[PDB]
């Protein structure tokens, strides 16, 4: 697979579309092992009308959603799949901590790792950094 995977091509892999596509670009990929993706945070995003009116703060849950989407794409790429034939459900979130406020101008770097794969259910470790510092970390479960 050709890196980086641009947003236009992430869309060929997963069905998510605006305003629920929370990855901009896949930058690293080791089959069945790891993936790096980014999401640029901009004040021109729909969530910032309401979160919060004069104080833009990237919602943690959207960072979580990006983490899950990264995990899902890692899985999909690993079996050479596409959006038309395969779906991985978001099954659970495990040890999610929100450590840093993320704001417009920040580039989120997501690093995810496949830990265990018992019976179509994948357990992943996922972290989201801004400028090297951890902003959110969590364990993410996906189910085929």
């Amino acid at each position: 697979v050709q890196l980086p995977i641009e947003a236009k091509d992430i869309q060929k892999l997963i069905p998510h579309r605006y305003p629920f596509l929370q990855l901009d670009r896949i930058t690293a990929f080791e089959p069945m092992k790891t993936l790096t993706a980014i999401k640029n945070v901009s004040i021109n995003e729909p969530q910032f009308q309401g979160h919060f009116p004069d104080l833009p703060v990237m919602p943690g849950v959207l960072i979580i959603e990006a983490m899950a989407q990264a995990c899902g794409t890692l899985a999909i790429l690993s079996e050479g799949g596409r959006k038309e034939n395969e779906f991985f459900f978001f099954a659970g979130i495990d040890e999610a901590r929100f450590k840093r406020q993320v704001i417009p101008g920040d580039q989120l770097v997501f690093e995810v790792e496949l830990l265990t794969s018992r019976r179509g259910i994948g357990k992943f470790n996922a972290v989201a950094k801004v400028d090297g510092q951890v902003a959110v970390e969590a364990i993410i479960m996906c189910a085929k």
Copy 2:
């Protein structure tokens, strides 16, 4: 406090606004203990443009966000507070399981419970039901 607390009044309690206000109404409240809230799921919501284009599925993370908002309002109401004083951060998610697809037409009923309050950090149990069945359950941490 006068029940039900309508959306217009939820907004006097928390700063969240469209499209990140994910409670429609508070229906039950026991100070320092429990709260029930609802969120109506409709096809006329912004997330359903992209999640997913022909197949509307309420994103789990938005159900999580609602659960967190319910926990936070339970806390706020318990110290008779408002949106303009100080704030409860979303600190973590613990044991979140996504058990049922939620779809337009479903009314989400959120029941949350304050478990422990060890030094500014509140640990809550939260469940989200549709028609009596559990759709999502999770432990939610908020920090003052």
Copy 3:
């Protein structure tokens, strides 16, 4: 036909899409006679940015539009039709009364009835209830 008809399948019947699809689910249907549909009202809907800024109130005209859509789907289902082969125009509204404020958290229940079918023009009676109380009633004309 299999009830309830979910939003995803309402979209196979009528061309309306976000933000102008104002039915969430079809719950009852008697061919050439009656139909029940619901629409969940949530603060997370686009109209509530502007109607009104701090006071969410479901616009009557959108309740009217839902009524018309329910009438139209009753008609379509009655001739086993689809969205791709022909269209029922909204021809007129006759004795529309707005009796109750509808607000986030309310579930609108729409009950519509085919009265007469003189000359490709269908005259319907339509009512919209919240919790058993009438909120809006009207006569709706559709033309094939």
Copy 4:
């Protein structure tokens, strides 16, 4: 009062905001009698994402809503009122006929007339024209 009343000033008269402000400009006004207003129809309006995906057609109910807003502003201007003191409810619609498809590029001209004012309830005749042809006509009731 100074004519034309621009959108910026229509907003000082009525509480409606995006996406539910359906008048662009007030062009004529006779106290307690008549008003003319316009609404420009553009493909760059939020309703045209869904109404309909490849076939932009101005929803009749929004034309109705504009008619009602024109009536309401006629009333407000007639008692020299503002958005912060007075509210006129939309009470009913009477003899509404949808005669012409309205499309992007059309400028809607609204001409409304106060017929009767029995006990705080105002009955108005309203027509909406494009290029001189009637597109929608209706009787509009507002209540103080």
Copy 5:
């Protein structure tokens, strides 16, 4: 070609969609020479949430974008092309002056003219009028 070209058909010619389709209707056309198009400005457009919060002012750059789209369609129509085969890039803007505030209620009339076509790069003169007065004028370059 059949005039006027309505928005529904402009979309068969160029790929631009909501909220970046800034032409409502093509009204005049001389192959390889000139084109007239209109864009209705309405308070019900997404840019007016932010530009500016209580003071709606049509952004100059969107007028520029419309001018470019008009130039592009003039080119496309001139080689009988469509959106699925041929595309013209926006290459530059030359002598753009913003002379008049444009506001809701204004109808923008765009008149564009092909000046030179040296080697796939088309240089156009473009003006945008409201009620005959120039609001914006510019030279627009497109590249095949």
Copy 6:
């Protein structure tokens, strides 16, 4: 002034709001001379629903708008002004070339310079880079 200036504070300087605030952060500033600002490009931005449906491409005109906003803020900061105080109009664009496609994932770096200030009219040179490469360059005029 304290650098970086975050989006929340850019808003105290200029009246632009969603979806027409096209700067995320001010990173450099020399009074009456230069300014650097960034804008993160994400697939989660409103323009990418329509520009273009399956092929996200940052519109050149929005890059232009950002360049102008950067120029304007340079000016505002230089006379210690604010948004409630006064306003710099966008007066013209001079020698604008679009050299590179900008896509989700790209961070735009804007570097602007005050050239001349002949009587309330400021002439600026402006460039927008992604990863060191020029994407757009232009001369920007603002008028007080």
